[PDB]
């Protein structure tokens, strides 16, 4: 459940600057989304607003993947950068 990823995502906030949030989350025994859910809720937007997961290492880049075993403890691991249109 622990892997510290700060992500850089364009937040649908009051229109402050794009929001990078450090969420430490992994795919629990249920879903990969729980990490995504973290970013969106951090922005006070519905979960739908961010998903893009790209790995940093020999594993170069990617997209926000389904419940993934890559939930190991690695800080520089797959980043998301997404913008959706939504706001609460």
Swiss-Prot record:
Q: What is this protein called?
A: Ubiquitin carboxyl-terminal hydrolase 19
Q: What does this protein do?
A: Deubiquitinating enzyme that regulates the degradation of various proteins by removing ubiquitin moieties, thereby preventing their proteasomal degradation. Stabilizes RNF123, which promotes CDKN1B degradation and contributes to cell proliferation. Decreases the levels of ubiquitinated proteins during skeletal muscle formation and acts to repress myogenesis. Modulates transcription of major myofibrillar proteins. Also involved in turnover of endoplasmic-reticulum-associated degradation (ERAD) substrates.
Q: Which organism is it from?
A: Homo sapiens (Human)
State the oligomer form and interacting partners. Interacts with RNF123. Interacts with BIRC2/c-IAP1, BIRC3/c-IAP2 and XIAP/BIRC4. Interacts with HIF1A (via N-terminus). Interacts (via N-terminus) with HSP90AA1; this interaction activates the deubiquitinase activity of USP19.
Q: Where does the record say this protein resides?
A: Endoplasmic reticulum membrane
Disulfide connectivity for this sequence is none
Q: Which residues of the full protein are shown?
A: 679 to 766 of 1318
Domain remarks in the entry? Contains two CS (CHORD and Sgt1) domains, namely CS1 and CS2, in its N-terminus and a catalytic USP domain (USPD).
Family per UniProt? Belongs to the peptidase C19 family.
